[PDB]
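Example complex used in Figure S2.
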Amino acid sequence: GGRPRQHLLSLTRRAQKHRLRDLKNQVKTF
DNA sequence: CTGCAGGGTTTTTGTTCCAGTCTGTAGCACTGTGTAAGACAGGCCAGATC
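Predicted assembly (30 residues):
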């Protein structure tokens, strides 16, 4: 049914790839 | 109910390469601190003996 995931500031900067996609796109379009 | 097997899942974590851009290091030929006396030999003039 998915997966529990701990908070972001403990993950590597890389770990991120998944989270900002939509914001990178929205700022670009903007 | 349990146990673990072995699949589903999302989500780490990293993967290959080509433009570059920054950053730290090795490459450069090359530098600083050792620093003052005496000992031994030979000559020979002085100077005292006598």
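Helices of chain A lie at 21-29. The two ends of chain A are 35 Å apart (CA to CA).
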